[PDB]
Amino acid sequence: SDLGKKLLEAARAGQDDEVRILMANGADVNAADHSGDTPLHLAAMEGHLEIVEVLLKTGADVNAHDLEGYTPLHLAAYHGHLEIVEVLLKAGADVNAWDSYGYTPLHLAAMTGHLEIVEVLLKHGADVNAQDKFGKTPFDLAIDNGNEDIAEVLQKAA
Amino acid sequence: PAIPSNTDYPGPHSFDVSFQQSSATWTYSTELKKLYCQIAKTCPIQIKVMTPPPQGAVIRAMPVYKKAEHVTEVVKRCPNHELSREFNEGQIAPPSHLIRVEGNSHAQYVEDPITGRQSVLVPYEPPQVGTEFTTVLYNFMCNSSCVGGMNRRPILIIVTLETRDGQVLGRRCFEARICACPGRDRKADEDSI
Ligand SMILES: [Zn+2]
């Protein structure tokens, strides 16, 4: 818990060296805080790519769900971290994982206007027909939030 | 009274609170009067007046639970966040306070001895010159979901314009959701329609 808590803090803060020394000293890579977020969740959310790579290569669970049902890929997609989305996908992230409102990563990328992330998600088999709790597709979230470049792309993939 | 009022009160200086995206991960719904923001990250809030407040006036931000069942309970940080090193190195802010002010060495942290209410005050300052608004930078220091703290209970932020002696000159309220993906929580609220 000592080392787990320290790893969760260093991962959110982007303290590359502290993460590396904590893993070396036996910190639990899948330590989870009271929101159910792992170091991999926090680093993915905050855009700390090197920390993400260190956590995956030391056995981070790429498809861990926090208490909201977010995987690290959900957080990387929402927050616009393309390099991290690519690394998570190459480490076997579930491209069509759904959170506690049935949002997929393609929903979150469509909603936030991250065109390049939409394209990499589609290449890895993101489901254009996936529906959230409210019957909305990523195309519909794109239209609602005025993301037209993304809307066109999602149509041509439908 | 003992329970803090949460009814907008423009009062004699026409006190209003607004949000503006500039060129940050927060989103404000003018429709739901609801701020969606991330833990510990800068949330700028704009104060408008029409006439100058008196000498020694202040702006206070106090969190209160929104739901009738919870309103008597002081909003403060969960033990996990209060006791952590994270966010707590070298603060004027006591580590139990949910609301901090960023960028003002004149922030005063208050805890009422009777009600136990925690709040943070700054001296009222008129806008820069040519600028319309007095900007206050807030940080919210727990997630809405924090177990042993807010525990998924919705809160209001009550912003009050006050004289030095605590007379309320103006009040505005908005809901705050502290979460991982503010736009996602906002979209889910909107689509529940
Ligand atoms: Zn907390």
Residue numbers in the entry:
A (entry chain B): 2 to 159
B (entry chain A): 125 to 147, 152 to 321
From the paper:
Using ITC titration experiments we measured a dissociation constant KD of 108 nM for DARPin C14 and 32 nM for DARPin G4 while no interaction with a control DARPin could be detected. In the second DARPin-DBD complex within the asymmetric units present in both crystals, this L1 loop is disordered. Pre-incubation with either DARPin C14 or G4 resulted in complete inhibition of binding to the DNA oligomer while a control DARPin showed no significant effect. Fluorophore-labeled DARPins were titrated with bacterially expressed and purified p63 isoforms and the data confirmed that both DARPins C14 and G4 bind to the DBD in both closed dimeric isoforms (TAp63α) as well as to open and tetrameric ones (ΔNp63α) with only weak influence on binding affinities. DARPin G4 bound to the DBD of all three p53 family members (205 nM to p53 DBD, 223 nM to p73 DBD) as this DARPin was not counter-selected against any of the other DBDs. However, co-expression with DARPin G4 did not result in an increase of the transcriptional activity as DARPin G4 also binds and inhibits the p53 DBD.
Here we describe the characterization of Designed Ankyrin Repeat Proteins (DARPins) that were selected as tight binders against all folded domains of p63. For the initial development of DARPins as tools to study the p53 protein family we have focused on p63. This transcription factor is involved in the proliferation and differentiation of epithelial tissues as well as in genetic quality control in female germ cells.
